[PDB]
Amino acid sequence: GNSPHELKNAAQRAADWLVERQRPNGALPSRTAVIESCYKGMWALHTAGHTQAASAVADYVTSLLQPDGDIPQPREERYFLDVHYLYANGYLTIGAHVLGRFGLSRKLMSFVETMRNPATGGFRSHGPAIPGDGRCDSVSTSISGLAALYTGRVDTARSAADFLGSLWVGQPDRKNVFHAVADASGAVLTSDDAVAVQVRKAEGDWYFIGLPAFFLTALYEATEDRAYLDLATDLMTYMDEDCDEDAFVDSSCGKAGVAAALLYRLTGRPRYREIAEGIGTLLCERQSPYGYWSEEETGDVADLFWGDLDMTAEYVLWLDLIGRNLASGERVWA
């Protein structure tokens, strides 16, 4: 595979591509003005050293911030309304905090906490303005727990991990389907309108497993509580041995790649290095010659569909995180 330096080089070229096209108000170059086009922008650009561009995204995000600490608009994609509303808020919180925008991160994180279910520790899938039944999903919960870790709200993160453990233990038929959603009481939801990963098919949505694995590994690093490492380990084993090969190939495999790279640094287990290396190389090989990522776009374009802009920022982050955990893991274990 490719070396940590090569993975980082790919991330930097994509970051440069984004910053060259950033708008004067700080928005990233999306064909639609929606928060789901740039929610990873602060954190990704900061990791690439583009701190003025990252702070410009913070300025743009601050201009959207409502008195309750939410960014309810502009939102268009249904997954950011009633599947995992808080997916945007979680990365916004992390990016703001690492930038030292402590007022923005406090306000964002305090809103995120209002959508926690205090009975289960899960985080509600649908936003305040979106009618729903109080269901909570693995992605809202994992990203909110990760934002809790970055902002030092470790008890909130521990509670999120409790929910993930209940969701995992409660699976009715895990060898065929991962039901990523629970009802407001914590029972796993199997209705057709609830996210379900067909683990024996090559149809994506693997990040509903991979993001929990990454969060739980970071929580273990923060706490040294082996219960969290055990659950992250079980989820990685699930993806590696019970899931279709698409789990480490689909566009959403970066989350599992990052979890694997962190688990390698913490445990030294070579399978984790192999998983992270393979995913990092795959993402590197799919990069356009210009710097962005897209499964369809092939030209020298000035902007991107929101999903490709999000993917481009996401892969800046995943390649950086994989690269630094592989490099330090090699120093520690090899």
**Contact set with its own copies (CB under 8 A):** 4-5, 8, 12, 15, 24-26, 46-52, 54-56, 58-59, 97-103, 106, 149-153, 218, 221-224, 320-321, 323-325, 327-328, 331-332
166 binds ligand A1AVA (CB under 6 A): no
Structure tokens at 93: 């919180």
Q: Does 132 bind ligand A1AVA (CB under 6 A)?
A: no
Residue nearest to ligand A1AVA (CB): 252
Chain centroid, CA 3 distance in Å: 23
- 251 in contact with ligand A1AVA (CB under 6 A): yes
For 3, which DSSP code?
A: -
Name residue 42's amino acid. Answer: M
CB 28 within 8 A of CB 57: yes
| CA gap 268, 278 in Å, rounded | 16
Decide if 88 contacts 71 (C-beta within 8 A): yes
Residues 64-93 that bind ligand A1AVA (CB under 6 A): 79
List of residues 6+ apart from 179 with CB closer than 8 A: 167, 171, 172, 188, 189, 190, 194, 195, 196
d(CA 226, CA 219): 10
From 300, 308, 217, 304, select the one nearest 255 (Cα to Cα): 217
* Member of 47, 55, 233, 252 binding ligand A1AVA (CB under 6 A): 252
The yes or no reply on residue 207 touching ligand A1AVA (CB under 6 A) is yes
What whole-number distance in Å separates Cα of residue 44 and Cα of residue 315?
8
Closest contact distance (angstroms) between CB of 85 and ligand A1AVA is 11
What, of ligand A1AVA, its own copies, none, does residue 82 touch, CB below 5 to 8 Å by kind? none
158 binds, among its own copies, ligand A1AVA, none (CB under 5 to 8 A by kind): none
What is the nearest approach in angstroms of ligand A1AVA to the Cβ of residue 201?
A: 16
Binding site partner of 259, from its own copies, ligand A1AVA, none, Cβ cut-off 5-8 A by kind: none
Stretch that binds ligand A1AVA, among 18-26, 94-102, 227-235, 305-313 (CB under 6 A): 305-313
Is the separation of the CB atoms in 215 and 191 below 8 Å? no
Q: Which residue carries 């406090």 as its tokens?
A: 106
CB atoms within 10 A of CB 20: 11
In angstroms, what is the minimal distance from the CB of 327 to its own copies? 5
Closest-CA residue to 117 (of 182, 41, 40): 182
Residue 80 beta carbon to ligand A1AVA: minimum distance, rounded to whole angstroms = 7
Task: Return all residues near 322 (Cβ < 8 A) that are at least 6 apart.
Answer: 4, 7, 254, 257, 258, 261, 276, 279, 280
Phi and psi for 188 in degrees, rounded to 5?
-65, 135
Name which of its own copies, ligand A1AVA, none residue 26 binds, using a CB cut-off of 5 to 8 Å depending on partner kind.
Answer: its own copies
Could you give the CA distance from residue 9 to residue 251 in angstroms, rounded to a whole number? 20
Helices (H) and strands (E) in the chain, counts: 12, 4
The entry of its own copies, ligand A1AVA, none that residue 307 binds, CB within 5 to 8 Å by partner kind: ligand A1AVA
In the complex, minimum distance from the CB of residue 254 to ligand A1AVA, in angstroms, rounded to a whole number = 6
Rounded least distance, CB 307 to ligand A1AVA, Å: 4
* Nearest distance, CB of residue 68 and ligand A1AVA, angstroms: 23
Q: Give the one residue of 157, 219, 259, 311 binding ligand A1AVA; rule: CB under 6 A.
A: 311
Task: Tell me which residues touch ligand A1AVA (CB under 6 A).
Answer: 79, 207, 251-252, 307, 310-311, 314
